[PDB]
Amino acid sequence: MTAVEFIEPLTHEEGVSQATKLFVDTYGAAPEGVWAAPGRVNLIGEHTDYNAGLCLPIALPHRTFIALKPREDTKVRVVSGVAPDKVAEADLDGLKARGVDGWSAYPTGVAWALRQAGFDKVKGFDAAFVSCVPLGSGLSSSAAMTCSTALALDDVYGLGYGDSDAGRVTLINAAIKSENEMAGASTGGLDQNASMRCTEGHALLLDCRPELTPLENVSQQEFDLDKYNLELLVVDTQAPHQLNDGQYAQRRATCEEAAKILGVANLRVTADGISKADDQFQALKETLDALPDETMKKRVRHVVTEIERVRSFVRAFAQGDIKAAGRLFNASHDSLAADYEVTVPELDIAVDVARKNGAYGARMTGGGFGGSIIALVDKGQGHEIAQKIADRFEKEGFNAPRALPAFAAASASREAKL
Numbered sequence: 001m002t003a004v005e006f007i008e009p010l011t012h013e014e015g016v017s018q019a020t021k022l023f024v025d026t027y028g029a030a031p032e033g034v035w036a037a038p039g040r041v042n043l044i045g046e047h048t049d050y051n052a053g054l055c056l057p058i059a060l061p062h063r064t065f066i067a068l069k070p071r072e073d074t075k076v077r078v079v080s081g082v083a084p085d086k087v088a089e090a091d092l093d094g095l096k097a098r099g100v101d102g103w104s105a106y107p108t109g110v111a112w113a114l115r116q117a118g119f120d121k122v123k124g125f126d127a128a129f130v131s132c133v134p135l136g137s138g139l140s141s142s143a144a145m146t147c148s149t150a151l152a153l154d155d156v157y158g159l160g161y162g163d164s165d166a167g168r169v170t171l172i173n174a175a176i177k178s179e180n181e182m183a184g185a186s187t188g189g190l191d192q193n194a195s196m197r198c199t200e201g202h203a204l205l206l207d208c209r210p211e212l213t214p215l216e217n218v219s220q221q222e223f224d225l226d227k228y229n230l231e232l233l234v235v236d237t238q239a240p241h242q243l244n245d246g247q248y249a250q251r252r253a254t255c256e257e258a259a260k261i262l263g264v265a266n267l268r269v270t271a272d273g274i275s276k277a278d279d280q281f282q283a284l285k286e287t288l289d290a291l292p293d294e295t296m297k298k299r300v301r302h303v304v305t306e307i308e309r310v311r312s313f314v315r316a317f318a319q320g321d322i323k324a325a326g327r328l329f330n331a332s333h334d335s336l337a338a339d340y341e342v343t344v345p346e347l348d349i350a351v352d353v354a355r356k357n358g359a360y361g362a363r364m365t366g367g368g369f370g371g372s373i374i375a376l377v378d379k380g381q382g383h384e385i386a387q388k389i390a391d392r393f394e395k396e397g398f399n400a401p402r403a404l405p406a407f408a409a410a411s412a413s414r415e416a417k418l
């Protein structure tokens with residue numbers, strides 16, 4: 001039985017080359033250019049983004065590439081390099097929310113979102129996608145697809161939102177709106193902020209209070225693994241997970257009803273009230289006594305402690321306290337498992353193997369219910385822990401996992417013009 005596979009990121013050259021070839025093969029004409037948005041890892045601050053909390057993503061070197069040409073009419077053609085025979089075709093003229101299904105919903109929905117926002121310059125396009133953000137990995141293949149399309153449409157229609165950070169929040173809202181209202185997949189804003197606003201060697205300290213301007217809601221935190229002789233191990237469990245199954249939405253609804261019983265606009269209000277209390281334990285106790293439901297107490301107890309763990313992680317990493325940073329990873333997972341109840345055996349067992357084989361800490365990243373774990377480990381130990389996870393997986397009768405190199409990489413950009 002064969003060694004655990006590592007999924008190497010497509011280079012600049014491979015992405016441009018493969019995106020354009022799929023373009024020419026499907027459409028015949030050359031694209032106007034090639035754009036790209038990365039997948040992401042969320043280091044800590046999970047199930048916080050839709051509660052107006054704190055998140056800390058990095059962008060992966062792993063990118064979705066779009067070759068795009070705008071069209072004179074309102075028709076949209078899209079093709080994906082995982083099925084280069086199925087061209088999906090749709091029409092923007094009079095298009096309604098939910099008006100496209102399948103994966104074509106996501107990129108079509110981006111033009112739909114921009115025309116809904118009053119960008120009357122935006123008509124149709126042909127696009128070809130090639131990605132190495134693994135599907136079902138919970139590393140935001142979704143956001144990589146929408147944010148690449150949103151940057152391409154901004155560029156070819158000359159909207160003027162692509163060449164600034166502040167500008168991209170308008171493209172981000174469009175990408176978010178495509179996923180929520182066209183693809184009908186509930187999403188909270190973490191993935192698309194990461195994909196369009198992270199920078200190399202930095203994590204994005206994202207504040208999700210919706211009243212904040214773009215300059216107020218991000219801080220670039222130094223995240224140089226080489227400084228501390230670290231490696232970030234990422235292992236996609238490949239556990240089975242129905243893409244959009246209602247679990248994520250139930251969570252959001254419980255939180256939204258938490259906030260209503262509590263009489264706050266959102267749980268970040270509640271979390272900030274507890275944090276600044278002398279006796280945080282007494283502050284959380286008085287909060288949970290207001291929620292009569294056992295499960296709702298646990299969801300709120302997760303969101304309150306998780307926001308504080310983001311502030312605690314940002315301090316720990318800047319101090320070079322990698323033991324303390326690892327413990328914060330461990331506490332975030334443990335909270336996701338017990339209090340939020342979004343883990344599965346594959347995630348728990350992968351984490352336990354990492355823990356018992358010298359990881360500073362390990363945790364599920366993104367939504368849960370499957371997908372990927374992340375581990376702060378010593379440089380040169382990633383392969384060994386990945387292979388230990390794979391061996392356990394086979395002993396368990398689980399599907400084989402796969403691992404990804406990971407480090408803080410660049411956000412969305414244009415890769416090619418002519």
Ligand SMILES: OC[C@H]1O[C@H](O)[C@H](O)[C@@H](O)[C@H]1O
Nearest residue numbers: 046047187188189190366367
């Ligand atoms: O941290 C939980 C996470 O789950 C998914 O990846 C969502 O799309 C994100 O917006 C975020 O809510």
Ligand SMILES: [Cl-]
Nearest residue numbers: 083084085086
């Ligand atoms: Cl096909």
